[PDB]
Amino acid sequence: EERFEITGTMRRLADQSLPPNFSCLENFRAYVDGFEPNGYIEGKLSQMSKEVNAKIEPFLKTTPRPIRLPDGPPCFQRSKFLLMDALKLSIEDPSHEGEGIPLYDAIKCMRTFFGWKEPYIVKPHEKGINPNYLLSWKQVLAELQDIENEEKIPRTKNMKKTSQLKWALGENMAPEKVDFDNCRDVSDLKQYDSDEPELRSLSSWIQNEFNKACELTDSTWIELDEIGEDVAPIEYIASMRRNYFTAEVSHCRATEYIMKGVYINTALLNASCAAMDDFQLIPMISKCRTKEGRRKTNLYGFIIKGRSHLRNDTDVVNFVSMEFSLTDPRLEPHKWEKYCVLEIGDMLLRSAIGQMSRPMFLYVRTNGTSKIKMKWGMEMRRCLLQSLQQIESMIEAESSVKEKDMTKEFFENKSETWPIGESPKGVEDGSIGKVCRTLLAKSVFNSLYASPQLEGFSAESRKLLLVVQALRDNLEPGTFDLEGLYEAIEECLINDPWVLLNASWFNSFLTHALR
Amino acid sequence: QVQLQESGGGMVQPGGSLRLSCLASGFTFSNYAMTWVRQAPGKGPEWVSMVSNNGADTTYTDSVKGRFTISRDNAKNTLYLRMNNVKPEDSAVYYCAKRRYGGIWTGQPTDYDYLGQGTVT
Amino acid sequence: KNPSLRMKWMMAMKYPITADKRITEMVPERNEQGQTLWSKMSDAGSDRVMVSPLAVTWWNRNGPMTSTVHYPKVYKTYFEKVERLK
Amino acid sequence: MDVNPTLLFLKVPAQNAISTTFPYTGDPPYSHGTGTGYTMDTVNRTHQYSEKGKWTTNTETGAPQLNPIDGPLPEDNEPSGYAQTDCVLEAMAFLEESHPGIFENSCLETMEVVQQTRVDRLTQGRQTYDWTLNRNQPAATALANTIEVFRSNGLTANESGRLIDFLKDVMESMDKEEMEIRVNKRSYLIRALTLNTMTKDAERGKLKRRAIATPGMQIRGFVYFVETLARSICEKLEQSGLPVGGNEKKAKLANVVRKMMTNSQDTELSFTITGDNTKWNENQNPRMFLAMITYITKNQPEWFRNVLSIAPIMFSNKMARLGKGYMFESKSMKLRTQIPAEMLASIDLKYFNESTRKKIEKIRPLLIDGTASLSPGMMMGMFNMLSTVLGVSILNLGQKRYTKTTYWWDGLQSSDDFALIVNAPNHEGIQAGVDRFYRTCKLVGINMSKKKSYINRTGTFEFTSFFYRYGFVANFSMELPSFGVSGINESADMSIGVTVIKNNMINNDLGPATAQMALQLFIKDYRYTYRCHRGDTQIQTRRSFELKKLWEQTRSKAGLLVSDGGPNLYNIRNLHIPEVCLKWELMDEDYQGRLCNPLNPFVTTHSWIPKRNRS
RNA sequence: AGCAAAAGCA
RNA sequence: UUCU
């Protein structure tokens, strides 16, 4: 309660924390008590120059110029797994056989296709030794066929530590640690190679990779749990919206990724903590549910993960990824810039007319995955909810006009024509269902291609929007410094092809909204 | 009042697929739970499946799990049923139904108001 | 630095929970089907009486059989909301 | 075809479809490295905008420290922390005139908390940086470590347990020359004023990091007092943004554009600004708060006028420890070497990068035992609730009782964001009313940004991600926390899961549809974790068999718990009821007999204590 | 080799 | 270390 005197030491600090023309606390405190407003502020302004002012630069339908994209070499793919070129082997089995252990469900699934040639190279890497992959597909294959001769029922097979699996992971390709007292004698030092990244151009393949996601398929790909029974009216309004939603997204190619980017990450995370030093074989496994009510258990490829001595929040583990596909790498090589291409055989098959007998390829490549780019995959099911929060708010905007319940929007098959496309010579429209897939895919790609650049573009490609929407509605808008906004947008367009695309969508929205 | 019709009935070989259908009128279809009961020749009826007013809470008999799927559509006032890999003894007449409570678990599962015009072999 | 992942990992390992010596004599060592729930590391302090979660569900299908009706009278405020919903 | 979602904005407006833009990919960008190269940048920028001030050496610390307060006036539109002390008090004085007696009442509610608190209300806080070990530790152990030091000496007046008796000890410890952990006077002060830096991770909505700093131990008690005082002061006000939040802020945003929009003399424009202040923390100087704190505490008792006055004295001589350091390398021998932080004061400059030399050069003077020293600014993450009252006082000027001119305004202010609503009878009168605010708000040291701000006629604006069209106030305050399992036990997670969804429905704006679907993803993560799949599901795991034994063993299956066998039975009408009280009577006499057993040997028989080592 | 960016894991 |  009693603090009548502070001290003799910290008192000397307070007299050192005051304005310039003051050298005491007691002599300054009473000056505050003696303060009364004599109109000081109007005096200071009379001395401020006229070079300190905010001039309203009025916005108009000819001011916003298009954003200037990077120019340079075309970009490459940087996804953890393949998206559209994948190819999956299946058993087509109600009460599928293995069904509890991915290994036997994978080996059993491999016996469908037959006619496997010897492995063969197609396109080298251009940076690194290529035959050191060809000696892995043979290595894994012998260790895989070894199981049928063993029939011990193993849960997971720790692979061998051959040189071929020692290099593409880089077990001892690291440098040595030492303090400065022993290193100061060395005369070749350097901080690091921290510099500016390389500017990459915009390529076409990412547009032909997003359309194919907003397209129907045959299966369902998801099965959610249950809830209680609804009696109130506010619940039937939910069950009506959610049921119209789920019956327009389950038949979508983007939900294949949400349940493919979960089984891959969670097994890689559960195994890589229980078996650190030894390698492993992790098969990419995705469990489907088709049209007829008939289960399936597909297989996309194998994974080989190396040493994982993880202790902190952001460690790193690296793996190789073997993926099947037919996409002949001779038309879009810049997309498959980092990928090593093998050849395995020829799928003897006939189309509805004629015959193809097309080949079957493999795409081997190393990778790296921290302990947070895995936990950001297992929660992809949050993406569905983020695509419904948008559709719900768009409905409650009409609610301010009338009842505007969900019934008057989902059917009426062609009544509003939401414009979600730019065909040549026009903007072709589609129903709300084609919208309720396009918001999802844009949301899924925002998790696969997560990066700091996308976080910066959206923060500054939002104000240029609201300034435009105030013009089209004719509210007489204004900005202060435009060219400081563009330069803070173009600073985030470097190399990520996703962000480098949205600056071609935004740049084509102005041209059709009369800028 | 209670009106329930059937469809899709027809002879079929074993190990084959089939899809049934029903229809309703005269009451709030999205406020009551449905079931499917079947009477085999010379045997009393028993329950096959149930379903709620959300389309969420589904159950099945012990002997037909994984081979029967059930799904409703409140908008068109129907109640589909897809049975795949049909067993031999599954040939019998199938009867639609309508629970009284909205939920399914409470009370014992038995038909209360319906007539099974539809059949199958 | 996150507890959720440690709950999925540790449940991959058997016998995640801890209880002192009273659980030892109550239930058997393993179920009829063979799954074990009464491991023992033989510690000096408390003997490390560790049990699998199977003992929980086993306790609810088989075990003591009390007749108390004290618990409905404790959670009274939570019982008052039950009549308003109905 | 070529799909393109952002053509969606031609039919539907922007304020309704704005959720398409929020990419939610702001969490996984983390900081790679140690994080000192940024902390050597915030010290530089703090000294470029306040270079003109006379800098002097301080006593009993041996360090230069800047002081731009009351300095000259600027000429360029660039930022500037050149405040004016005779101007700040003039604003906060008029705040009392428009709001009578707001200060003298607010201090009274704080004058009793100082005597009716406890030291244990301090430890309930974030992570701290204890000054003994020189490492970040939690708030629980840092108090036992420092109090043992105070107990090691003859001073033991902390026995009363009151927080105010912890402050009398540190005040009675700072004067002793040498301390017995050993360490002298000039070496102990430098360790109590520190603010450890660390690169900020998980930045949601920014390209590059921010380099925030965490405080010590002795300081975090004083700032709790002043932060309490600015809370009450900013609670009785009308245009506040920080303390007023949630759904109630949805209402306040529409009242302002109702008052200021009333059209008397209906020949008058009405414009509205959406703003964002740049370098909000690099410019504010605690010497100004010391002018404010001693003005708030006018005619108050002396001892209470002292204690609040102490914290800005410490911030006015603060120091920021540098990060773990740099890591050099050589491609010849292929090694990496970890440099400490202190060696940067002696390392040769030629090894470093070219731009890293530009940082260390200007910071080469400011080095006190491997610790930089600055006092023109404030640190990120520290208290700013008091610095919101400052800019609010500018929103008081504009009631036509302080301009004496036709133009006038009134607005709404969070910390780094605001919004004005100006009114004048022509375009030109508006350009003067705003030119007076950008100017008058510079004398106080609060710059306005000219890139992240636009202007439009009223009826629509942005503020703190509460987007406002003509009457619609759709809010996006905080994102969704994944509705996942926590990891405590069975009965603990299931209670937390079906109450967080409740709170996010009445606090934020979460529709009735996306609350059901969220409850499907939570239970999907709850069953896979604890392996508690219900019986009729034909799954098989290391626990599945015994559950099916109990499934067939019971009559009415709606009574069972979800933790073992039972079904989900919730919806968006009964989330506010725990699981056991919901399906109590529904249970049969057998399950009920074995469920709530007072002889439960595990310990509510599902709640256990897992095995924890904390390695 | 690749992860991935203004500095670190290999 | 099985999310039909």
| Cβ neighbours, 10 Å, residue D509 | 18
Chain A residues within 8 Å of chain B (Cβ atoms) = 94-95, 224-231, 236, 239-240, 243, 292-295, 411
| Cβ neighbours, 10 Å, residue A355 | 9
Among chain D residues, CA nearest to C65: D593
Which residues of A fall within a CB distance of 8 Å from C12?
270, 274
Rounded CA separation D366/A20 (Å):
21
Rounded CA separation D101/D232 (Å):
13
Closest CA–CA distance from residue D487 to any residue of chain B (Å) = 27
Rounded CA separation D193/A437 (Å):
55
Sheet strands side by side (includes B3-7): B3-7, B18-25, B78-83, B68-73
Question: In 3-state terms, what secondary structure has residue B48?
Answer: strand
Here the tokens at position D180 are 């017995």
The answer, for D581 touching chain C at a CB cutoff of 8 Å, is: yes
What are the residue ranges spanned by the domains of chain D? Answer: 8-59+70-239+280-393, 247-279+394-457, 490-595
Does residue A458 contact residue A443 with C-beta atoms inside 8 Å?
no
- The CA-CA-CA angle for residues A468, A474, A476, to 5°, reads 80
* CA closest to F3 C1', residue: D528
Please state at what angle helix D286-296 crosses helix D102-113, rounded to 10 degrees. 100
Q: Do B54 and A94 touch (CB under 8 A)?
A: no
End-to-end CA distance of chain C: give it in Å, rounded: 43
- The CA-CA-CA angle for residues D202, D206, D207, to 5°, reads 100
Rounded CA separation A271/A256 (Å):
23
C partners (3+ CB pairs within 8 A) are: A, D
Q: Do C17 and D543 touch (CB under 8 A)?
A: no
Interior/surface letters A435-451, b for 16+ CB within 10 angstroms, e for the rest: bbbbbbbbbbbbbbbbb
Closest CA–CA distance from residue B25 to any residue of chain A (Å) = 19
The CA-based dihedral angle spanning residues A312, A313, A315, A320, taken in that order and rounded to the nearest 10 degrees: 140
Distance D83 CA to F4 C1' (A): 68
Closest CA–CA distance from residue D553 to any residue of chain C (Å) = 8
Question: In 3-state terms, what secondary structure has residue A439?
Answer: helix
Q: Which of A270, A313, A375 sits opposite C12 (nearest CB)?
A: A270
Rounded CA separation D493/D522 (Å):
10
Rounded CA separation A366/A319 (Å):
5
Q: Where do we find the tokens 């600056």? A: A503
Does residue C60 contact residue D543 with C-beta atoms inside 8 Å?
no
Contact of chains A and B by CB distance (3 or more pairs under 8 angstroms): yes
Q: Which nucleotide comes closest to A296 if you measure CA to C1'?
A: F4
Scanning B60-89 for CB atoms below 8 A from A yields 66-69, 74-75, 82-85
**In the Cβ-directed half-sphere of D615, how many Cα atoms lie within 13 Å?**
4
What's the CATH code, domain D247-279+394-457? 3.30.70
How are beta strands C49-51 and C39-40 bridged, if at all?
A: antiparallel
Here the tokens at position D498 are 């079906």
Does residue C65 contact residue D594 with C-beta atoms inside 8 Å?
yes
Q: Which nucleotide comes closest to A366 if you measure CA to C1'?
A: E2
Contact of chains C and D by CB distance (3 or more pairs under 8 angstroms): yes
Among chain D residues, CA nearest to A370: D28
What are the residue ranges spanned by the domains of chain A? Answer: 59-79+450-515, 80-178+252-377, 203-251+378-449
How are beta strands B46-51 and B58-60 bridged, if at all?
A: antiparallel
Resolution, rounded to a tenth of an Å?
3.8
D partners (3+ CB pairs within 8 A) are: A, B, C
Which residues of C fall within a CB distance of 8 Å from D593?
64-67
Nearest to A304 by CA among A164, A148, A99: A164
Q: Where do we find the tokens 């997309």? A: A335
**Structural domain range at position C54:** 3-85
Q: Which of D487, D573, D577 sits opposite C81 (nearest CB)?
A: D577
State which residues between 22 and 41 of chain D bring their CB within 7 Å of strand E.
Answer: 29, 31-38
State which residues between 329 and 388 of chain D bring their CB within 7 Å of strand E.
Answer: 336, 353, 356
Would you say the C-beta of A180 is within 7 Å of strand E? no
How are beta strands A176-178 and D56-57 bridged, if at all?
A: unpaired
Does residue A82 contact residue A320 with C-beta atoms inside 8 Å?
no
Question: In 3-state terms, what secondary structure has residue D547?
Answer: helix
The answer, for B41 touching chain A at a CB cutoff of 8 Å, is: no
Rounded CA separation D4/A426 (Å):
13
Could you give the C-alpha distances from D160 to D310, D465, D473, in angstroms and in order? 22, 46, 50
The partner residues of B81 in beta bridges, in order of sequence, read B20, B70
Q: Which of A226, A239, A293 sits opposite B69 (nearest CB)?
A: A293
Does residue B95 contact residue B115 with C-beta atoms inside 8 Å?
yes
In chain F, which nucleotides are within 7 Å of a protein Cβ? Answer: 1-4
The answer, for D557 touching chain B at a CB cutoff of 8 Å, is: yes
Contacts of residue B48, defined as CB under 8 A and 6 or more positions apart, other chains included, come to: B35, B36, B37, B38, B60, B61, B64, B68, B94
| Cβ neighbours, 10 Å, residue D45 | 13
Q: Do A385 and D518 touch (CB under 8 A)?
A: yes
In the DSSP assignment, the letter for residue A462 is T
Q: Do A375 and C5 touch (CB under 8 A)?
A: yes
User: How many domains does chain C contain in total?
Assistant: 1
Q: Do D3 and A492 touch (CB under 8 A)?
A: no
* CA closest to E5 C1', residue: A197
Here the tokens at position B70 are 């059930």
Which residues of C fall within a CB distance of 8 Å from D600?
59
User: Contacts of strand F, CB cut-off 7 Å?
Assistant: A 99-101, 155-156, 223, 259, 262-263, 266-267, 270-271, 274-275, 287-289, 295, 378; B 65-66; C 12; D 524-525, 528, 537-542
Which residues of D fall within a CB distance of 8 Å from A8?
175
Could you give the C-alpha distances from D536 to A96, B66, D547, D567, D610, in angstroms and in order? 18, 11, 10, 10, 29
Which residues of D fall within a CB distance of 8 Å from C65?
593-594
Closest CA–CA distance from residue C2 to any residue of chain A (Å) = 10
The partner residues of A359 in beta bridges, in order of sequence, read A346
How are beta strands D335-338 and A176-178 bridged, if at all?
A: parallel
Rounded CA separation D359/D233 (Å):
41
Compute the count of residue pairs across chains A and D with CB atoms less than 8 Å apart.
Answer: 421
* CA closest to E6 C1', residue: A194
The answer, for C69 touching chain A at a CB cutoff of 8 Å, is: no
| Cβ neighbours, 10 Å, residue D171 | 19
Q: Do C9 and A313 touch (CB under 8 A)?
A: no
Among chain D residues, CA nearest to B62: D536
Rounded CA separation D89/D84 (Å):
9
**How many helices (DSSP H) and strands (DSSP E) are in chain B?**
0, 8
Contact of chains C and B by CB distance (3 or more pairs under 8 angstroms): no
Rounded CA separation D30/D199 (Å):
9
Best probe of the D interface among B63, B68, B105, by most D CBs < 10 A, is B105
Distance D33 CA to F3 C1' (A): 35
Here the tokens at position D339 are 């440099």
User: Max Cα separation, chain B?
Assistant: 38
Q: Which nucleotide comes closest to A96 if you measure CA to C1'?
A: F4
Question: What is the separation of C-alpha D374 from the centre of its chain, rounded to a whole number of angstroms?
Answer: 22
Q: Which helix (H) or strand (E) holds B24?
A: strand B18-25
Rounded CA separation C44/C42 (Å):
7
